[PDB]
Amino acid sequence: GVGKTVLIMELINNVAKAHGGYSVFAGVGERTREGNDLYHEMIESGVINLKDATSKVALVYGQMNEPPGARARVALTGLTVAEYFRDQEGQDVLLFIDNIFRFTQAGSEVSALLGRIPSAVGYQPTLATDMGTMQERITTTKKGSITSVQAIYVPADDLTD
Amino acid sequence: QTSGGPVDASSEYQQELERELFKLKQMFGNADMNTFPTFKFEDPKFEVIEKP
Amino acid sequence: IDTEKSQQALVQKRHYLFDVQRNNIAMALEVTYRERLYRVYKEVKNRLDYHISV
Amino acid sequence: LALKTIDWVAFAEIIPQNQKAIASSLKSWNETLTSRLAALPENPPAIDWAYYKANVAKAGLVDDFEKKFNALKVPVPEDKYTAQVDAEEKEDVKSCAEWVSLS
Ligand SMILES: Nc1ncnc2c1ncn2[C@@H]1O[C@H](COP(=O)(O)OP(=O)(O)O)[C@@H](O)[C@H]1O
Ligand SMILES: [Mg+2]
Numbered sequence: 001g002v003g004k005t006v007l008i009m010e011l012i013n014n015v016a017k018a019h020g021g022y023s024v025f026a027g028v029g030e031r032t033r034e035g036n037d038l039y040h041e042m043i044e045s046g047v048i049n050l051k052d053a054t055s056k057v058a059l060v061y062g063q064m065n066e067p068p069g070a071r072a073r074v075a076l077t078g079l080t081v082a083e084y085f086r087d088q089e090g091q092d093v094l095l096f097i098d099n100i101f102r103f104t105q106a107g108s109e110v111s112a113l114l115g116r117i118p119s120a121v122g123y124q125p126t127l128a129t130d131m132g133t134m135q136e137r138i139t140t141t142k143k144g145s146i147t148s149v150q151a152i153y154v155p156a157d158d159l160t161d
Numbered sequence: 162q163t164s165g166g167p168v169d170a171s172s173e174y175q176q177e178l179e180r181e182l183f184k185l186k187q188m189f190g191n192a193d194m195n196t197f198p199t200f201k202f203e204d205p206k207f208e209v210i211e212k213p
Numbered sequence: 214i215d216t217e218k219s220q221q222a223l224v225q226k227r228h229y230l231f232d233v234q235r236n237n238i239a240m241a242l243e244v245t246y247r248e249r250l251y252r253v254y255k256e257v258k259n260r261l262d263y264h265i266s267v
Numbered sequence: 268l269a270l271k272t273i274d275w276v277a278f279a280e281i282i283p284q285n286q287k288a289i290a291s292s293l294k295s296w297n298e299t300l301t302s303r304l305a306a307l308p309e310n311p312p313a314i315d316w317a318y319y320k321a322n323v324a325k326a327g328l329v330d331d332f333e334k335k336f337n338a339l340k341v342p343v344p345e346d347k348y349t350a351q352v353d354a355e356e357k358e359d360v361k362s363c364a365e366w367v368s369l370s
Contacts (some may be wrong), residue, residue, distance in 0.1 A: 088177075090180050090183075090184065142184060143181075143184065144184075182267055185266060189259060189263050189266075192223070192260075194259075194260045194263040194264065195264075195328070196260075197257075197260075197331070197332060197335050198253075198257060198259075198260055199227070200253065200341075202249055202252075202341070202342060203245070204344060205241050205242065205344070208350060210234045210289070210293070210352055211352075211355040212284070212286075212355065213286050213289070213357060217370050218327065219284075220370060221367050221370055223280065223281055224281075224363045224366060224367060225367075226274075226277045226278075226280075227281055227359065227360070227363055228276045228312060228356065228360070229273055229274065229277055229281060230278065230282065230290065231352060231353070231356040232271050233273055233278065233290075233293055233297060233360070234293065234352045235271065235349060235353070236270055236271055236348060237293055237296055237297050237300065238346070238348055238352065239270070239299070239346075240268065240270065240300045241296075241300055242343075242344050242346065243268060244300055244303055244304050244306060245316055245343065245344060246343045247304070247307060248307075249341055250310065250311055250328040250341060251307070251311055253336070253339065253341055254290070254312075254313075254314065255311070257314075257332060257336050258314045260332070261314070261319050261323070261329070261332065263329065264323050264324075264325055264329075265319065265322055265323050
């Protein structure tokens with residue numbers, strides 16, 4: 001409740017609709033009513049057009065009401081959509097992810113049951129490696145650019161988590 | 162057996178090959194790099210420097 | 214008298230005000246001349262390394 | 268490039284207050300040139316052709332470039348201002364030669 005979603009919606013208002021290429025919003029473990037708000041806001045703003053093919057945003061949504069597997073792989077689904085728009089189209093893509101912390105949190109929830117000795121604060125032993133294999137796909141190459149804005153939740157206001 | 166087809170029977174990827182040079186072209190600018198470069202040479206900015 | 218002597222000394226140094234303008238001009242052109250020799254070489258090479266990059 | 272050294276402490280005291288900004292701005296332009304002039308060679312490295320003669324798959328382009336480049340006479344700007352500032356000095360010295368006479 002400090003303003004991650006308000007700031008990312010401000011960035012969408014300022015940069016996304018004023019953009020030339022395409023945009024991708026991957027909702028990863030957040031409020032479903034915020035996803036509905038975003039859908040209807042993009043419909044009224046002409047960004048998402050239900051009547052023709054002039055739409056400029058692709059939405060991927062696995063929210064906080066989803067089991068941990070869906071919340072762990074919906075970030076990868078959004079990544080894959082943006083990666084197509086970067087490689088096979090050469091476009092300049094905007095990738096918004098909110099929230100990217102739910103990916104790690106769902107990984108921890110499932111790692112509990114996968115029979116793995118837990119690391120610090122009870123997190124999976126493979127935290128940094130999974131985060132790396134996910135984050136190294138969100139990058140600009142010489143085949144296209146991906147301007148990535150990711151909201152990152154901080155547990156208990158601890159930036160050393 | 163490519164002298165007839167120079168890309169060893171590419172059969173695809175030409176649709177994206179020209180995108181590669183385009184990305185490569187916007188990296189070197191926009192001018193047609195197949196001819197000699199033009200020129201316009203600038204001159205310094207001067208004033209009167211005497212005892213006012 | 215001595216104050217009139219110094220006024221002869223100060224005006225003796227006058228020429229520096231014109232020596233700067235000469236120096237500040239003479240090299241100013243050399244700077245443009247030198248930099249002009251890049252805008253030709255830095256571009257013809259650019260149009261050469263292109264046809265070797267592609 | 269026959270530069271002339273300048274004692275800035277001598278330059279500092281022989282300026283009148285009514286034009287200190289000009290002479291101070293002239294100082295500003297001065298050192299900015301000195302480093303910029305020293306921050307790049309007098310002549311760029313004349314690029315090779317042998318690496319381009321053979322490793323470029325175009326005919327004529329790698330020579331007519333070098334031919335047109337060599338046949339390109341980049342104009343060096345003439346002074347057209349050194350004698351004009353010298354026109355002031357000789358007159359100034361004339362105005363100051365009489366002053367040291369009357370003194
Ligand atoms: N830039 C802002 N201007 C005004 N109010 C803000 C701003 N950012 C946050 N707030 C307030 O703080 C609250 C938190 O909003 P939110 O972005 O959803 O936090 P978070 O997503 O991190 O949980 C909002 O309800 C809003 O009232
Ligand atoms: Mg939020």
